Amino acid sequence: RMKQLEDKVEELLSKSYHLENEVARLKKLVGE
Amino acid sequence: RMKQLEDKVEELLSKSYHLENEVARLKKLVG
Amino acid sequence: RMKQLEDKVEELLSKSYHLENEVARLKKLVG
């Protein structure tokens, strides 16, 4: 089902958003 | 609708490439 | 096209896991 893929993609967009913020916190808190 | 998903996936592929490069840099500067 | 989307989403999920893991390593090496 298409629904199946839509749920996985929704999860991937949320994971990506979170990862982006983590990368920002790390490059700020000297993770350079 | 399928087009809708294809576009979201293409954007996720682009964002993932960018993040992998950011992570790679972060890593080199810490090690 | 459907099989193609499934393949790309599988690649994206694997990439997401690797990035998350690398970021978790970096929280060790930055501290």
Swiss-Prot record, chains B, C:
Per its record, what triggers expression of this gene product? Translation is induced by amino acid or purine starvation, or during growth in low or poor carbon sources. Translational repression during nutrient-rich conditions is dependent on four uORFs (upstream open reading frames) present in the 5'-UTR of the mRNA; these promote ribosome dissociation. Translational induction occurs in conditions reducing translation machinery efficiency, leading to ribosomes scanning over the uORFs, and increased translation of the mRNA. The rapid translational induction is followed by transcriptional induction at later time-points, independently of the uORF sequences.
As for PTM, the annotation reads:
Phosphorylated by the cyclin-CDK PCL5-PHO85.
Subcellular locations according to the entry: Nucleus
Phenotype upon knockout? Abolishes recruitment of the mediator complex to the upstream activating sequence (UAS) of amino-acid starvation responsive genes. Decreases RNA level of genes involved in amino acid biosynthesis and cofactor biosynthesis during amino acid starvation or methyl methanesulfonate stress. Growth dependent on amino acid supplementation. Sensitive to amino acid starvation. Sensitive to purine starvation. Decreases cellular glycogen levels during glucose starvation.
The segments labelled Leucine-zipper in the record are 5-26
Quaternary structure, per UniProt, is:
Homodimer. Each subunit binds overlapping and non-identical half-sites that flank the central CG base-pair in the pseudo-palindromic motif 5'-ATGA[CG]TCAT-3'. Interacts with the mediator tail; the interaction with GAL11/MED15 is direct. Interacts with the SAGA histone acetyltransferase complex. Interacts with the SWI/SNF chromatin remodeling complex.
The record's domain comment reads:
Residues 89 to 100 and 106 to 125 define the N-terminal activation domain (NTAD) and the central acidic activation domain (CAAD) respectively, which can function independently to promote high-level transcription of the target genes.
Please report which protein family the annotation says this sequence is part of: Belongs to the bZIP family. GCN4 subfamily.
Role according to the record: Master transcriptional regulator that mediates the response to amino acid starvation. Binds variations of the DNA sequence 5'-ATGA[CG]TCAT-3' in canonical nucleosome-depleted 5'-positioned promoters, and also within coding sequences and 3' non-coding regions. During nutrient starvation (low or poor amino acid, carbon or purine sources), it activates genes required for amino acid biosynthesis and transport, autophagy, cofactor biosynthesis and transport, mitochondrial transport, and additional downstream transcription factors.
Q: What is this protein called?
A: General control transcription factor GCN4
Give the organism the record lists: Saccharomyces cerevisiae (strain ATCC 204508 / S288c)
Within the intact protein, the region shown is 249 to 279 of 281
